[PDB]
Design a binder for this molecule. Structure first.
Ligand SMILES: [Cl-]
Ligand SMILES: [Cl-]
Ligand SMILES: [Cl-]
Ligand SMILES: [Cl-]
Lengths: 99, 99
């Protein structure tokens, strides 16, 4: 579901992803997601890589590592980032349409 | 480069991808791309999966298989789809923001 955060059931580069696909766009067995990296370089653009807060820690939304995942790898839902829809939307639009 | 079509140097599900990343968005060593599938089911949405023409054949832009690729896998440039920027933009925006 769009803006919900999930763990990977199978080991990936990162440990969390946010679903960014529209809830009325149907891809049977898959969803478009952006991985979240532990925020641990400060000067990297916050416009393209928003900082979000999950499990009492900072994470960078790795916008340029966007990829589809099969539902078979989608594990527990850990959080909802719908309150950050404005920065998520700004980041996604910047990556394709910037300047 | 945005809207340019390339072959994969290493075997992938598909054989072509279109660069969809802005030319002023810098991801050292990588680019955001959408694979092209040989068009060979007709009733699949042309709004979400545009039909394009390369090497005298029809291809579907596999919008929901969007992923980053390392420059190391980017082979020969085979075509330019900049003339289809309107349908490509419509498809990408539909996948995130549809309804
Ligand atoms: Cl991490
Ligand atoms: Cl947050
Ligand atoms: Cl194919
Ligand atoms: Cl075309």
């Amino acid at each position: 579901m769009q803006f919900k955060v999930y763990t990977y059931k199978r080991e990936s580069r990162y440990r969390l992803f946010v679903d960014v696909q529209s809830d009325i766009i149907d891809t049977p067995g898959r969803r478009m997601v952006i991985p979240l990296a532990s925020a641990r370089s400060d000067k990297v653009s916050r416009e393209l890589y928003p900082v979000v807060h999950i499990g009492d820690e900072e994470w960078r939304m790795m916008t340029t590592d966007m990829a589809s995942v099969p539902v078979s790898v989608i594990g527990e839902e850990v959080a909802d980032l719908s309150h950050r829809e404005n920065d998520i939307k700004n980041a996604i639009n910047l990556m394709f349409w910037g300047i």
